[PDB]
Amino acid sequence: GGVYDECCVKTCSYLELAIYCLP
Amino acid sequence: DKECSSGLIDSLERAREFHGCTIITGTEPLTISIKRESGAHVMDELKYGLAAVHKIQSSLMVHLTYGLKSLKFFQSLTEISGDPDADKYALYVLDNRDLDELWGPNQTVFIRKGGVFFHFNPKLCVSTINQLLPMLASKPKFFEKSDVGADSNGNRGSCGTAVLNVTLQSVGANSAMLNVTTKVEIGEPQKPSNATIVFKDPRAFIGFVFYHMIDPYGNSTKSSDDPCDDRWKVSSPEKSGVMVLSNLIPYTNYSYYVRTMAISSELTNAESDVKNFRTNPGRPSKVTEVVATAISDSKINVTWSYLDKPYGVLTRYFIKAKLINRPTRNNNRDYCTEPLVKAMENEYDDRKVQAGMEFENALQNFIFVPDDENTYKDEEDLSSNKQFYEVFAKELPPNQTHFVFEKLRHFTRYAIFVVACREEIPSEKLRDTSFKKSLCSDYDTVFQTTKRKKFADIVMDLKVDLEHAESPVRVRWTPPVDPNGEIVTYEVAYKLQKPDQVEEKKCIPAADFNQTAGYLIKLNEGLYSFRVRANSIAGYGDFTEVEHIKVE
Amino acid sequence: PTMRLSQNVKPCKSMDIRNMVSHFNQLENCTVIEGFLLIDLINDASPLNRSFPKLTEVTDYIIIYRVTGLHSLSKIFPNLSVIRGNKLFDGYALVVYSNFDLMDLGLHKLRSITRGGVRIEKNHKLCYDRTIDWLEILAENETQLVVLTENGKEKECRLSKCPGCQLHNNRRLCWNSKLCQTKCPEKCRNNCIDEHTCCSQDCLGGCVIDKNGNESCISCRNVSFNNICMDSCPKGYYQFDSRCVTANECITLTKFETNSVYSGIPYNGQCITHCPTGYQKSENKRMCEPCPCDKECSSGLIDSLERAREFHGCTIITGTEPLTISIKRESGAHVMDELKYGLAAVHKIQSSLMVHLTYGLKSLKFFQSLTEISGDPADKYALYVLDNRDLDELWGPNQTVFIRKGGVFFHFNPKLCVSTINQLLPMLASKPKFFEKSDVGADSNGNRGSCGTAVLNVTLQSVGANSAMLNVTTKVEIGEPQKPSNATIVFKDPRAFIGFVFYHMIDPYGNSTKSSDDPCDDRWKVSSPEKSGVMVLSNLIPYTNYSYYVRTMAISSELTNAESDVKNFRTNPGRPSKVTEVVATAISDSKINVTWSYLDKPYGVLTRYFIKAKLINRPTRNNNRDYCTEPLVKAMENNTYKDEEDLSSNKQFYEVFAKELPPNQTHFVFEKLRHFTRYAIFVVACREEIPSEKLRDTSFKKSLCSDYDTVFQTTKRKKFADIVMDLKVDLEHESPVRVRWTPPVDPNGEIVTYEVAYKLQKPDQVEEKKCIPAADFNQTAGYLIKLNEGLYSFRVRANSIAGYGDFTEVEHIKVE
Amino acid sequence: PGNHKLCGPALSDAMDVVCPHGFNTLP
Numbered sequence A: 001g002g003v004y005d006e007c008c009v010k011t012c013s014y015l016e017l018a019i020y021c022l023p
Numbered sequence B: 001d002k003e004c005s006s007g008l009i010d011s012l013e014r015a016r017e018f019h020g021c022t023i024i025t026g027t028e029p030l031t032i033s034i035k036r037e038s039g040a041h042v043m044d045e046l047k048y049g050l051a052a053v054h055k056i057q058s059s060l061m062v063h064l065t066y067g068l069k070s071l072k073f074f075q076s077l078t079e080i081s082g083d084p085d086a087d088k089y090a091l092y093v094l095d096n097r098d099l100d101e102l103w104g105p106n107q108t109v110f111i112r113k114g115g116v117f118f119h120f121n122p123k124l125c126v127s128t129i130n131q132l133l134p135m136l137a138s139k140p141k142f143f144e145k146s147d148v149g150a151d152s153n154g155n156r157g158s159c160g161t162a163v164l165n166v167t168l169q170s171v172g173a174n175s176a177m178l179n180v181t182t183k184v185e186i187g188e189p190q191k192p193s194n195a196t197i198v199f200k201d202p203r204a205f206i207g208f209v210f211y212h213m214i215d216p217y218g219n220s221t222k223s224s225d226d227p228c229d230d231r232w233k234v235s236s237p238e239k240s241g242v243m244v245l246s247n248l249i250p251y252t253n254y255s256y257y258v259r260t261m262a263i264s265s266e267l268t269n270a271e272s273d274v275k276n277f278r279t280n281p282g283r284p285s286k287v288t289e290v291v292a293t294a295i296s297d298s299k300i301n302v303t304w305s306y307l308d309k310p311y312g313v314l315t316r317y318f319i320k321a322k323l324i325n326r327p328t329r330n331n332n333r334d335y336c337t338e339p340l341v342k343a344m345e346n347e348y349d350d351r352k353v354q355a356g357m358e359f360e361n362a363l364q365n366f367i368f369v370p371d372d373e374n375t376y377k378d379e380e381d382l383s384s385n386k387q388f389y390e391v392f393a394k395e396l397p398p399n400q401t402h403f404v405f406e407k408l409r410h411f412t413r414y415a416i417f418v419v420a421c422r423e424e425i426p427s428e429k430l431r432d433t434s435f436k437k438s439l440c441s442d443y444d445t446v447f448q449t450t451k452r453k454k455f456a457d458i459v460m461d462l463k464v465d466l467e468h469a470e471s472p473v474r475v476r477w478t479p480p481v482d483p484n485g486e487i488v489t490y491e492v493a494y495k496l497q498k499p500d501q502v503e504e505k506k507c508i509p510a511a512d513f514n515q516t517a518g519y520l521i522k523l524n525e526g527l528y529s530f531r532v533r534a535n536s537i538a539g540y541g542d543f544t545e546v547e548h549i550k551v552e
Numbered sequence C: 001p002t003m004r005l006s007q008n009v010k011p012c013k014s015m016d017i018r019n020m021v022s023h024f025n026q027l028e029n030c031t032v033i034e035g036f037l038l039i040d041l042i043n044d045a046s047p048l049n050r051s052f053p054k055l056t057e058v059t060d061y062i063i064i065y066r067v068t069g070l071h072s073l074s075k076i077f078p079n080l081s082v083i084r085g086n087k088l089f090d091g092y093a094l095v096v097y098s099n100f101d102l103m104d105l106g107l108h109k110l111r112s113i114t115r116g117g118v119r120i121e122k123n124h125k126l127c128y129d130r131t132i133d134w135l136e137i138l139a140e141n142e143t144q145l146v147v148l149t150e151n152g153k154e155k156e157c158r159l160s161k162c163p164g165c166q167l168h169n170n171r172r173l174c175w176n177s178k179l180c181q182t183k184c185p186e187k188c189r190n191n192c193i194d195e196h197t198c199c200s201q202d203c204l205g206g207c208v209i210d211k212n213g214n215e216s217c218i219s220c221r222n223v224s225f226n227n228i229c230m231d232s233c234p235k236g237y238y239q240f241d242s243r244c245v246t247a248n249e250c251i252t253l254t255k256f257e258t259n260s261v262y263s264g265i266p267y268n269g270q271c272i273t274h275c276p277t278g279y280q281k282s283e284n285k286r287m288c289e290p291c292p293c294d295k296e297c298s299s300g301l302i303d304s305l306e307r308a309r310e311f312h313g314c315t316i317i318t319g320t321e322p323l324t325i326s327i328k329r330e331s332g333a334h335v336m337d338e339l340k341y342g343l344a345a346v347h348k349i350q351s352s353l354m355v356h357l358t359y360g361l362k363s364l365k366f367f368q369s370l371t372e373i374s375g376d377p378a379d380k381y382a383l384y385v386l387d388n389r390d391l392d393e394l395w396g397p398n399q400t401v402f403i404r405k406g407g408v409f410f411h412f413n414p415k416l417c418v419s420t421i422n423q424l425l426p427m428l429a430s431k432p433k434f435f436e437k438s439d440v441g442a443d444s445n446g447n448r449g450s451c452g453t454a455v456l457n458v459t460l461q462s463v464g465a466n467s468a469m470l471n472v473t474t475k476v477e478i479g480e481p482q483k484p485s486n487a488t489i490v491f492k493d494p495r496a497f498i499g500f501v502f503y504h505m506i507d508p509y510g511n512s513t514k515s516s517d518d519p520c521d522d523r524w525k526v527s528s529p530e531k532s533g534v535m536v537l538s539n540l541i542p543y544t545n546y547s548y549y550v551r552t553m554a555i556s557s558e559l560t561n562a563e564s565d566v567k568n569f570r571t572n573p574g575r576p577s578k579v580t581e582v583v584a585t586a587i588s589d590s591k592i593n594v595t596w597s598y599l600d601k602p603y604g605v606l607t608r609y610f611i612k613a614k615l616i617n618r619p620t621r622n623n624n625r626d627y628c629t630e631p632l633v634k635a636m637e638n639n640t641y642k643d644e645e646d647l648s649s650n651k652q653f654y655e656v657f658a659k660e661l662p663p664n665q666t667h668f669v670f671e672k673l674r675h676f677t678r679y680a681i682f683v684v685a686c687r688e689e690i691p692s693e694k695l696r697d698t699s700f701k702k703s704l705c706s707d708y709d710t711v712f713q714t715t716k717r718k719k720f721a722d723i724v725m726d727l728k729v730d731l732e733h734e735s736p737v738r739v740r741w742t743p744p745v746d747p748n749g750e751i752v753t754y755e756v757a758y759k760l761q762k763p764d765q766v767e768e769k770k771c772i773p774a775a776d777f778n779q780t781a782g783y784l785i786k787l788n789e790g791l792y793s794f795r796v797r798a799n800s801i802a803g804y805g806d807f808t809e810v811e812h813i814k815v816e
Numbered sequence D: 001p002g003n004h005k006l007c008g009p010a011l012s013d014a015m016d017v018v019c020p021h022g023f024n025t026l027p
């Protein structure tokens, strides 16, 4: 999901952000 | 009591009409609808008129007001009987712009019956509404949405201001810096130590803005009775928590305070206390209207005063007096041929930030995939002959502005200086050796001349001579040594010792005195009386006594 | 004209450069990008040794974000020419954000941005930024989407020298110190080889001109096909974003969206992305089949129009979540049309909607497809409008969407005239005649902006140099309308009306706008309300530009007030000010020089300077003291305008010097005055006479000239001549000696005393001197003398009011 | 680290530090 929806709207954490960090 | 009429107050003069009314009556509500155009003293007139009232019979209403910040003028007000506006509302507040404060914090009002009404109060503070909760007789647990337009009030007037420590680090004679020691979290803190104040986005927090001004008494309030005010010099925002001020008045009592600037949509803010400081004793102002008068050939009276700003504390007055090179002969033209009479001479906008805000949000969501001897100390220079001081200096206490000086060279023009100076302040003594200095002010010259002496150094050793005793008669004398300035001519004179003869006179330069120290004349046979005077750059001298010789 | 395209077209779809410089190889050989293109997160762009001039166009938009190691965007694209703007990201077309190494663009090859706007932001190292004219590179219609800041140029970028290069708006137009910007002639609008040499307008992005003279468009104005430019595509070929495409290839082609890969739809001659209203893509997904069309979608929040893109095609919106358009914008950008695209489908919604903290919304007009909200909660409030500092009106005159439940909540809408809200009533279920006081702010909305009110007229009817009065020309329908039409200024209840109020100020330029809401910062002066429609001003500054306006103050909780526009007038000349810094200076015993200036408000067309000098009696002998006692050694010194200087009775000197001089002059010089006499001086400026004055104020009140004041000056000392003459001495026969002379004819003031002097021819002798207060000198016909025996010489000098005169020459005498 | 509420440029910095390389590309 969109970061601004998944973060800065409702909380989140790095382990959730790791979904984006895929080469 | 006067029990004056209730009803409509559409303008200030109506309040003026009800001056001194301790009681207000009339079941119709007291309606306050002053639309005045912000031209100051609206609150002052309201208190002048309405501050006497302590009790209101009917309900009271306020709406459509312009420029009103608060009802604080109700100093005497104590209770509202609230006689019907209807039974529902003892007090009614609607569409009141600029209104941001209720009755005085230490005051407590009593509401007799019914409820109240508060909607469309953008500058009024929702939390402040709860203060009325104990004031109502019925003691409700809270004012409901029906009574409180919470979402419609205070949306750009929030009040949850966390106090902010603010202290200087030091100050010069013209500048200062401020360094907010309170730490503020711009991102979400994720719970570090303390972090009492926070913002949800660094971009929403514009930065700190500083207010400062000049107040000898250190009592200037934050707000002003007139909503428009400029006593506070206001600067640009910054986010480092540190600012530097310049172009300040040395040793001047200042007052300052800072506030957080954030987007209007944002409603959290922080605010500091009113604090003061003084700005180091700086350069003194040079002495004022210095003047002096000669008391004698040897004495002079000097006066001065200090009216200008001290920029500190006057440690002592310092005096310097100098002999300038003595007035010299003007050989440009001849004396004698003509004599000399010894005369003398004398709101914020958020648009751009938010435009950046939302565009950045959309982008990020799109991208990602899954000439002066400044030593200035007392000293004297004494003549080689020790009859006069060629230079004089003195320290004097700062509590008298005139002085006399003596043992000057009998005839001459003098140059004198007076200056005030400040202390070696502890903030400066630590390094006041690598120049710095600047303790004492500059100064201005005063030029004056001493009086002429008791007598113009009466030429001495007068005598009359004759060689080969026929040969002309000769007159001799020793030249003066202490004339009032350079001698310019000798005026020899004589008379024939008989009735009704005039007593002639002459004038001559310093010629032929080296050769024989005396003048000669081929005077005719007879008996005469002789005398002489001389003249210096200070014009005329004075005559000697008489000598007599018979001639043939 | 159908004609050749420059270079073969090798199109390629949208590609993204991400995380590696190596990915640039993916952009090989493309003449054009049939989509968007972006470069991001390249921290070390140093290996960019290769450039790609082959490409010349990308259709949708460009974004450059968080890239370092790159100097100028021209490094990668030498020949990018045009952006066709088929899809606009956030409305913009060019975006470069947060790229620290970016100091320059250098794209002197681009020629047109077909739609949207440009956005270069927070690229600190950027320089030579404002010198680029972006208003020219956008379309000629309203397209102001230029946004630039955050570069610290005032200190970091002072390098704006440029060649010398064209200069407009008081600065050069450049890309950097080398590449100067170039506008082709106004006929072109960027379809040109250079400033003047342009191909046909069909050549978007300029052209190549063959050495044989054949033009070669870089891009086609309308469309392209097989390296040719044409206005329309051949039959059987659908248009796809720059070019004609077969149905099969359209099907193979695709257009991308934030979360979709939609395939091309060959339909009605164009490679459509998705179906219009009343149509749906078939289960074959090769064409749009007709339907009804109706489509359901979830409610939510709209923060930026980029999200609004997701809601296109939804006829219905469901979900109890209040819908909230919360968009904002630097200017009145494409928001309206983009929201038209996004929302034109919706006609029905399950829950209420709110609008707050929004900027740039001109109106809700884009919602015309809506018909009913149905309410849902935002509790028990039908519609919510809070803190939207640009919204002013909602919908078209015929569009009215019903609201079944809840009350409205409008606040902080300073440009929304409340009258529009008064229209909303029939759409609410209760059909009330008024709103509950907690619903809509009576003054929190529309107050700051004009946005309405009725028009009004006024005219100045008479003017004085210090006063004026004005008279409204519009009708005023107090109570029942007596005369319909022709402007009314209706007030249904006479009690509601109060009176007209006038405002005015001093304004040299006459562009002060209108009353100001904020406390202080006001410069207009208000006036009391009045009924007749006529009011009088006074105490005005003469011959000054004044501005004024009129409005109906009578609110009385009545919303039909009227207002007039600003107007200007000038006061009458009045009276001129006194001449400034007037100084008179002696030149000789018969000459004077005087200078002046007029550093003040003329108060009328200054027409002359009234120079006047009147001879004044010289100081006379004062019998207070006998001046032989000591000498007064030297001189001391400190209405109907008319011409005609005058001369003395003896014609020796001027008695009056009342003169006409133009305002041209600032100084004058004078001659033939009498020695040691005092003169009183005037210099007074005068204005012209008003046409009314010369026929109404002829008898008196003049006021054409300023006020006179006296300046004083003396002729200096007289010349040395005329002291004493006819000097000679004689004897009475022991006998008294006598001396004689005649007194000066015109001494330096009246003789105070004769001052005789004499000296023996004896060497070294000093002379002796004496005075005479004119005695009976002439009765005795000579002064009387008694001296000792001998031979003597004599002199005399004049002693007068001006002090000591010079000595006359000598003669000698013997006594035995 | 634990729970997060990053916003503004801070979120971009946090993403950049969470991984120095690798994003799936939008297509």
Ligand SMILES: *[C@@H]1O[C@H](CO)[C@@H](O)[C@H](O)[C@H]1NC(C)=O
Pocket (backbone or CB within 6 Å): B163, B164, B165, B166, B182, B273
């Ligand atoms: C000042 O700082 C102290 C801690 O050093 C804190 O307890 C106090 O609340 C602060 N006061 C203000 C006004 O900032």
Ligand SMILES: *[C@@H]1O[C@H](CO)[C@@H](O)[C@H](O)[C@H]1NC(C)=O
Pocket (backbone or CB within 6 Å): B167, B179, B180, B181, B182, B242
């Ligand atoms: C002054 O600012 C510095 C950082 O510039 C900070 O470390 C220091 O704590 C500040 N002083 C005070 C008293 O907080």
Ligand SMILES: *[C@@H]1O[C@H](CO)[C@@H](O)[C@H](O)[C@H]1NC(C)=O
Pocket (backbone or CB within 6 Å): B217, B219, B220, B221
């Ligand atoms: C501050 O003190 C001065 C002098 O006592 C006084 O005139 C002034 O009214 C005071 N102001 C306040 C706000 O206390």
Ligand SMILES: *[C@@H]1O[C@H](CO)[C@@H](O)[C@H](O)[C@H]1NC(C)=O
Pocket (backbone or CB within 6 Å): B397, B399, B400
């Ligand atoms: C001035 O100060 C000195 C001490 O420095 C003191 O002795 C003297 O009495 C003072 N005089 C006046 C007039 O204040």
Ligand SMILES: *[C@@H]1O[C@H](CO)[C@@H](O)[C@H](O)[C@H]1NC(C)=O
Pocket (backbone or CB within 6 Å): B301, B302, B303, B402, B403, B404
């Ligand atoms: C002369 O000097 C004395 C001693 O300093 C002082 O008291 C007096 O005032 C001076 N004279 C004048 C005219 O000030």
Ligand SMILES: *[C@@H]1O[C@H](CO)[C@@H](O)[C@H](O)[C@H]1NC(C)=O
Pocket (backbone or CB within 6 Å): C025, C028, C029
């Ligand atoms: C670009 O086109 C040339 C032929 O003109 C071809 O040889 C080359 O391989 C192409 N580029 C790439 C990266 O394949």
Ligand SMILES: *[C@@H]1O[C@H](CO)[C@@H](O)[C@H](O)[C@H]1NC(C)=O
Pocket (backbone or CB within 6 Å): C397, C398
């Ligand atoms: C809107 O309504 C008016 C009558 O109120 C009518 O004259 C006009 O034709 C209508 N316009 C449209 C576009 O329906």
Ligand SMILES: *[C@@H]1O[C@H](CO)[C@@H](O)[C@H](O)[C@H]1NC(C)=O
Pocket (backbone or CB within 6 Å): C471, C472, C473, C534
């Ligand atoms: C105002 O002007 C109208 C004509 O425009 C005139 O009829 C009327 O008399 C004027 N009012 C006054 C008070 O003169």
Ligand SMILES: *[C@@H]1O[C@H](CO)[C@@H](O)[C@H](O)[C@H]1NC(C)=O
Pocket (backbone or CB within 6 Å): C456, C457, C473, C474, C475, C486, C487
């Ligand atoms: C109001 O003034 C305009 C010109 O400013 C004029 O065209 C119009 O006819 C005037 N209306 C009336 C009612 O006088």
Ligand SMILES: *[C@@H]1O[C@H](CO)[C@@H](O)[C@H](O)[C@H]1NC(C)=O
Pocket (backbone or CB within 6 Å): C509, C510, C511, C512
């Ligand atoms: C408008 O007035 C301002 C002064 O208030 C002046 O500087 C400016 O040149 C004026 N502009 C025009 C177009 O009159």
Ligand SMILES: *[C@@H]1O[C@H](CO)[C@@H](O)[C@H](O)[C@H]1NC(C)=O
Pocket (backbone or CB within 6 Å): C587, C593, C594, C595, C667, C668, C669
């Ligand atoms: C008179 O004064 C004016 C002052 O500007 C000067 O220009 C001019 O030369 C003077 N002329 C004479 C004769 O003094």
Ligand SMILES: *[C@@H]1O[C@H](CO)[C@@H](O)[C@H](O)[C@H]1NC(C)=O
Pocket (backbone or CB within 6 Å): C664
């Ligand atoms: C002053 O007068 C002279 C001669 O009449 C003329 O040539 C000159 O232009 C005038 N100057 C001004 C400023 O009027």
